[PDB]
Amino acid sequence: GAPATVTEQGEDITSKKDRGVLKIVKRVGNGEETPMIGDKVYVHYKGKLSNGKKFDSSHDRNEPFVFSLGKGQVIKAWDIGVATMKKGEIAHLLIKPEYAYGSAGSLPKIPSNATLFFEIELLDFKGE
Numbered sequence: 001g002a003p004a005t006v007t008e009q010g011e012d013i014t015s016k017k018d019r020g021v022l023k024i025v026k027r028v029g030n031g032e033e034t035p036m037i038g039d040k041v042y043v044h045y046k047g048k049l050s051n052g053k054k055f056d057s058s059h060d061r062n063e064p065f066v067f068s069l070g071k072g073q074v075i076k077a078w079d080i081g082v083a084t085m086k087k088g089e090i091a092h093l094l095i096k097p098e099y100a101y102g103s104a105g106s107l108p109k110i111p112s113n114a115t116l117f118f119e120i121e122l123l124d125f126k127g128e
């Protein structure tokens, strides 16, 4: 499925080229602009453990998930991945534990050394 396709054909967007954050663009956005550190960003997302044992959607809240980019308000893989996205874009990310919750995890919700998958839609971003 989606996670396996990202393993096989996904772009490595880490600085370290360690395959810790892999990306496929599923729908292209608009304009050239991508968000800067500090920008307020608005997204819809669906997320799961790679084996599918916990599943979370912003659609379950009916409302966008909102955060300031690059302030570590989310896991490092989102700061990395969303910074690459254009307004309107939908992308898949597959993420190793080092760019998510690591060997400590976040129990009971996230186990130790968990790989994560997300589908992300970038709705908008606005300057500080």
Ligand SMILES: COc1cc2cc(c1OC)O[C@@H](C)CCn1cc(nn1)CCCOC(=O)[C@@H]1CCCCN1C(=O)[C@H]2C1CCCCC1
Pocket (backbone or CB within 6 Å): 045, 047, 048, 049, 054, 055, 056, 065, 073, 074, 075, 078, 106, 109, 110, 116
């Ligand atoms: C580790 O705890 C959680 C992880 C995730 C979601 C969590 C959560 O409980 C705080 O709550 C959901 C269920 C309620 C909405 N929400 C998101 C956040 N705070 N509240 C932000 C929490 C930080 O989350 C993240 O950095 C990432 C990226 C942003 C969206 C949510 N993220 C998650 O890791 C989910 C997680 C995805 C994998 C399946 C299980 C949930």
